[PDB]
Design a binder for this molecule. Structure first.
Ligand SMILES: CC(C)=CCC/C(C)=C/CC/C(C)=C/Cc1cc(C(=O)O)cc(O)c1O
Ligand SMILES: [Cl-]
Ligand SMILES: [Cl-]
Ligand SMILES: [Cl-]
Ligand code: NA
Ligand code: NA
Length: 352
């Protein structure tokens, strides 16, 4: 054990926590992502996710920040369903609501009236195939005011999503109901593929974690195949290479590192985690952030199969007329990515 590397993990985590606490807005929200001149900037979703990521820290001042985040989420009580959404002006969605319920658990509020109401609302998003859909059709059509989408199918946006199903399965009340859907959606290579995310490491880590938390021996082969996939994804240099980041995605690497925590016996897995930690420590910026790489994609509303859509472009790189559909946006504040990385390092440190 190299005590310098453990001490650098302390210093790295601390610098990231400082960045994240200072990055909150006037009311105290974490904000990230932007749909310019339209849905604008995420707050409820980003705050629920960042708060959940930070729940792994033992620090009293971090717990205080999470208690404040929950108070802010409870003030967002304007939707008749009790759900949360991307930000104030969006309708409710199952993904935001699921992350908000994970944050509620971290602050002892799983049994609160609001949490009970929001969990009940999640049940409306369950699909006949046993997964969770992000949106109710009536709610998201009401929000969207784009003429050429008026009479189009929303069955893509309102279908079962593996990414959101995996996140909701982190909630004990839903884990058993979503089990079979998560099992049957695993690919032949051992990974899962998500709807709103480019990086399969996110959906794969969350799904394997939900199967692990259920404790069923029947699920351990699936978990092990996912870990084997993660080991393949991680380069010897310590990063997951992507088309966009061929020398390593900080977001994909952090999620892969979380996936690899699910096997604590295999020496190759242990060495891969050590490599990923070293690379992440080297990539940290002086302000304690990591480079933004949380790539959120917007399929057409009618598209059930975004992993079969070869036309993705980065919204911020498109010249001239552009639309959100078929484009990828990112966490311009680096809050989403940094929270992800810092969580992965806190969880992985003790397994060095
Ligand atoms: C927490 C979740 C589920 C994140 C996934 C991304 C997501 C769907 C954000 C919600 C905001 C939204 C509808 C962005 C797309 C859009 C907006 C408009 C508009 O605001 O006018 C128009 C579009 O055509 C469009 O695709
Ligand atoms: Cl209550
Ligand atoms: Cl790169
Ligand atoms: Cl797909
Ligand atoms: Na309440
Ligand atoms: Na509409």
């Amino acid at each position: 054990l190299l005590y310098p590397k453990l001490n650098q993990l302390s210093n790295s985590i601390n610098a990231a926590v400082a960045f994240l606490l200072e990055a909150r807005n006037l009311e105290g929200w974490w904000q990230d992502f932007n749909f310019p001149q339209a849905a604008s900037i995420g707050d409820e979703w980003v705050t629920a996710y960042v708060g959940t990521m930070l729940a792994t820290l033992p620090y009293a001042h971090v717990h205080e920040a999470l208690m404040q985040a929950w108070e802010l989420l409870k003030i967002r009580d304007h939707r008749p369903t009790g759900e949360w959404g991307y930000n104030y002006i969006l309708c409710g969605d199952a993904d935001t609501t699921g992350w908000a319920l994970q944050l509620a658990a971290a602050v002892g509020a799983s049994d609160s009236e609001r949490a009970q109401q929001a969990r009940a609302a999640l049940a409306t998003h369950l699909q006949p195939n046993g997964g969770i859909a992000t949106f109710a059709e009536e709610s998201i059509r009401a929000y969207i005011k784009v003429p050429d989408l008026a009479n189009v199918s929303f069955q893509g946006w309102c279908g079962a999503h593996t990414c959101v199903s995996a996140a909701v399965a982190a909630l004990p009340e839903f884990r058993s109901r979503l089990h079979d859907y998560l099992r049957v959606t695993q690919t032949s290579q051992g990974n899962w593929e998500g709807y709103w995310w480019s990086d399969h490491e996110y959906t794969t880590a969350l799904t394997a974690e939900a199967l692990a938390a259920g404790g069923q021996a029947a699920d351990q082969p699936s978990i092990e195949q996912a870990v084997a996939w993660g080991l393949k994804r991680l380069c010897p240099q310590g990063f997951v290479a992507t088309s966009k980041h061929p020398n390593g995605s900080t977001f994909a690497t952090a999620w892969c590192l979380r996936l690899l925590l699910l096997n604590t016996v295999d020496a190759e897995v242990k060495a891969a985690r050590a490599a990923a930690i070293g690379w992440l420590l080297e990539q940290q910026r002086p302000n304690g952030s990591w480079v933004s790489s949380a790539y959120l994609r917007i399929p057409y509303p009618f598209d059930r199969n975004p992993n079969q859509f070869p036309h993705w472009r980065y919204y911020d790189e498109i010249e001239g007329d552009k639309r959100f559909e078929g484009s990828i946006i990112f966490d311009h504040n680096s809050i989403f990515t940094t929270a992800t990385v810092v969580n992965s390092l806190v969880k992985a440190a003790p397994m060095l």
